[PDB]
Amino acid sequence: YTKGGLRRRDLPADPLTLFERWLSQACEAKLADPTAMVVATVDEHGQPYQRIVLLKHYDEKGMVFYTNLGSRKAHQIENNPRVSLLFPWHTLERQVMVIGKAERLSTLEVMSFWGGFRVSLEQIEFWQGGEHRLHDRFLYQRENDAWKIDRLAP
Template sequence: MPDNDELQNIAHLRREYTQGGLRRRDLPSEPLVLFERWLKQACDARLADPTAMVVATVDERGQPYQRIVLLKHFDDKGLVFYTNLGSRKAHHLERNPCISLLFPWHMLERQVMVIGKAERLSTLDVIKYFHSRPRDSQIGAWVSQQSSRISARGILESKFLELKQKFQQGEVPLPSFWGGFRVSFEQMEFWQGGENRLHDRFLYQRDGNEWKIDRLAP
């Protein structure tokens, strides 16, 4: 456990954000254009897991939950991720499709937040992606009943070896409990760190067939 002096020092941890600002004149009319540009820059900067996003869902009592998931595809229809359909997040989205995504590109002093609704992908889309994964990842999808309680890691490792032997020949079949979601979005917010905590924030909100852009106070 940290001592009291270490805990007191947390309040004083800060740094200046100096990598540049974001101006209204530089914004494209479509949020996905800026998102693609920023994602490419995150990849080019060799950030660890540039496609990692925090996925927030809410249970039936209104309790929010968050976890990190990898973005696997995006286009005008939305942002796509895959998961075990028995997982906590999948159960939440069955009852309440409202969802929030956050891309925390700290090293570039940037964040992107997406607010929208999630819908299940078609089986065809899921199969196509599933068989593009490394074979061991396909087998790994069979192993875990995501979010369920287990007594030891060895249970997972033994199950993996068992299934690896079972699927030694031929194609690994798609598990019935594995699928994906597409997040169609109505809002996308871009945050760029600024000096003296004067950060730049711009919110895109869908307005019919166009996007309304507002600058937000930091």
């Protein structure tokens, strides 16, 4: 019981506005773990590593998830803050990608040894369904206190 069509003219000014529209629909629809996102990290050799974590909060400063601060991710993040997030909503032909730096949350907002990270929003991509296979893709690049928007290839 479907969805098809993502053209430049449905694009909101704040990407978080399109994100929320997609996250509700995911929860509206069946989709198990609407908030599950795959976070990628890179260790000191250049190797990426992946694992799912749940999105707990989000606003313009970034996306937040919690984790044990002594696990492979926390350790990798501390040597490399560059991470990537991907909401795998392929049940609805969708995908949301977020590139950004993982700053360690304060010991304040977490209210031991168990904290969380906030991933800033430097880029956010939206990939959408495709009857035929004309994948709609739109990238939001954070530029100069503004969002530079672009259409990409399928």
